[PDB]
Design a protein around this ligand. Structure first.
Ligand SMILES: O=C(O)c1cc(-c2ccccc2)no1
Lengths: 300, 237
């Protein structure tokens, strides 16, 4: 188990760690998060008490370095940094742990929720969507736009998700206009899976990362990408059986974790009704359909 | 975006544009079978592609063989229309290609957009005008060429005959829409209004009779009366 210590907490803030969250008071003796499970990526995220504008946060993997958080009073935010002095790091953490100044990552033993949400998400792929090569961790916030959003404006601060556009020359072979528009299998299997992602695991990783950024930061372009990657599969007549079964599991745990009160803004009625009730794959997502109908029947 | 009565004069400016109406592409008769079921029989159709400024009509005749062994024909017809309009645009010299294509039915937007991806600067637009272009097959010479076709064929017409020698394209389009609306509402009565006087004839190279300016005023008034008469019969007014 690994640790993300905090130098201090000078401003009141709600702190998230993966799907958990807690409140820290202004100048409270908080010095970080311990017992973080090794083997998964993680995200540590923030919403200031005095200004809920800009949710922001950091994706990281404790296997890739020793990371800590320190508040910057000039830029007005909690910043992740890497400590290269290993013995300094351990010495600081030990003082903080001995004085019980850290919260414990509160994982129930029965609970696979975080694994189920991040099964295909790897740090190396995150760092290609979020480009800041000098850091081993990745900053994301609520207002960051996507490359596709910027084509329709600072490129250094953008989310480089794979562009999906159903009415584009990439999606439609000349001479196969009706076929390719009504059955997106070409676009899914040849263009996206064989060509760009190389395999379904990378595709699902980006889909899962998009969802998590929509949920944890309210990032709109991430929500658009999540829905586009679902619709591309559901609108394809020919999808490998293992992908359909895995997608049903992926979406089930996403819909299970979504805050009930954020559904009006995180779920696109058109896409979900099309995917569950009209698409080629309308009968292939049994678990997702059942949780959607029992949890959000109004959307449908 | 959409095209309506606020921006109506835009149809007659100097930016090349085409209306596309797909109503008559897939045409069927419905009949009983020997076993008492119901079956369709397709008949020849046409795409109505019109330049409202010049009167040039590109009538692509859709022969029933294009439907042979195909499924979901009402859906296919929209994509066949878009395929043929795209092929027409590609066949025209650059300086004759339209800057806008206006579809009379919104279901044509996505098929035409997809077939025209290679032409990102041609705008594909709907319209809020309810245009009576379905009644094109009530123009005898258009119906005759479509029904006699034994293979796919494109035929070119000027749907304004020689009117633009004497009137503007705004007035010519208004006359055409009034005539087509009347033919749509009561075809026999409209055909009788158009052909009752035997001394006024249709030139070999025209679609409509050779009315003088004053006679066109009379005909237009008779057509408006027909439409109002039919509205009164319909709604009991
Ligand atoms: O030129 C023709 O073919 C024509 C004219 C008429 C006609 C008949 C009744 C009343 C008015 C016109 N029928 O055929």
């Amino acid at each position: 188990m690994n640790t993300v210590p905090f130098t201090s907490a000078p401003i009141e803030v709600t702190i998230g760690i993966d799907q958990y969250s807690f409140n820290v008071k202004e100048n409270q003796p908080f010095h970080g998060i311990k017992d973080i499970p090794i083997g998964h990526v993680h995200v540590i995220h923030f919403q200031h008490a005095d200004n809920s504008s800009m949710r922001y946060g950091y994706w990281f993997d404790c296997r890739m370095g020793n990371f800590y958080i320190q508040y910057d009073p000039k830029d007005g935010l909690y910043k992740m940094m890497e400590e290269r002095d290993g013995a300094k790091f351990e010495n600081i953490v030990h003082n903080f742990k001995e004085r019980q100044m850290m919260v414990s990552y509160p994982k129930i033993d029965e609970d696979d929720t975080w694994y189920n949400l991040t099964e295909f998400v790897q740090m190396d792929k995150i760092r290609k969507i979020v480009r800041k090569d000098e850091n081993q961790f990745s900053y994301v916030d609520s207002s960051m736009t996507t490359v596709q959003e910027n084509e329709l404006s600072d490129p250094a601060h953008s989310l480089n998700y794979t562009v999906i556009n159903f009415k584009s020359r990439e999606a439609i072979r000349p001479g196969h206009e009706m076929e390719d528009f009504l059955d997106k299998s070409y676009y899914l299997n040849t263009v996206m899976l064989q060509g760009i992602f190389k395999n379904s695991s990378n595709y699902f990783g980006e889909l899962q990362f998009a969802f998590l950024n929509a949920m944890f930061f309210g990032n709109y372009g991430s929500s658009l990408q999540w829905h586009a990657m679902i619709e591309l599969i559901c609108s394809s007549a020919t999808v490998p059986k293992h992908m359909l079964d895995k997608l049903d599991e992926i979406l089930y745990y996403q819909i299970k974790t979504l805050p009930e009160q954020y559904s009006d803004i995180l779920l696109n009625e058109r896409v979900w009704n099309i995917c569950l009730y009209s698409s080629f794959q309308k009968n292939s997502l049994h678990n997702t359909e059942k949780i959607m109908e029992n949890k959000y029947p109004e959307l449908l | 975006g959409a095209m309506n009565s606020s921006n109506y004069a835009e149809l007659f400016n100097n930016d090349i544009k085409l209306f596309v109406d797909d109503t008559n592409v897939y045409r069927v008769t419905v009949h009983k079978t020997f076993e008492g079921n119901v079956a369709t029989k397709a008949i020849n159709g046409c795409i109505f592609t019109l330049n409202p400024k010049t009167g040039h009509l590109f009538l692509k005749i859709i022969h029933t063989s294009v439907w042979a062994g195909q499924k979901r024909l009402s859906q296919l017809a929209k994509w066949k229309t878009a395929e043929e309009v795209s092929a027409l645009v590609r066949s025209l010299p650059k300086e004759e290609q339209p800057k806008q294509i206006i579809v009379t039915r919104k279901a044509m937007l996505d098929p035409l957009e997809v077939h025209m991806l290679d032409f990102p600067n041609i705008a594909i637009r709907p319209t809020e005008l309810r245009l009576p272009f379905s009644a094109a097959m009530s123009i005898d010479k258009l119906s005759d060429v479509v029904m006699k076709a034994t293979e796919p064929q494109m035929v070119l017409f000027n749907i304004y005959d020689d009117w633009l020698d004497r009137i503007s394209s705004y007035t010519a389009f208004s006359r055409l829409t009034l005539l087509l609306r009347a033919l749509k509402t009561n075809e026999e009565s409209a055909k009788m209004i158009l052909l009752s006087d035997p001394t006024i004839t249709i030139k070999s190279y025209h679609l409509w009779p050779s009315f003088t300016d004053e006679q066109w005023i009379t005909i237009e008034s008779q057509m408006r009366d027909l439409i109002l008469t039919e509205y009164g019969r319909k709604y009991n007014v």
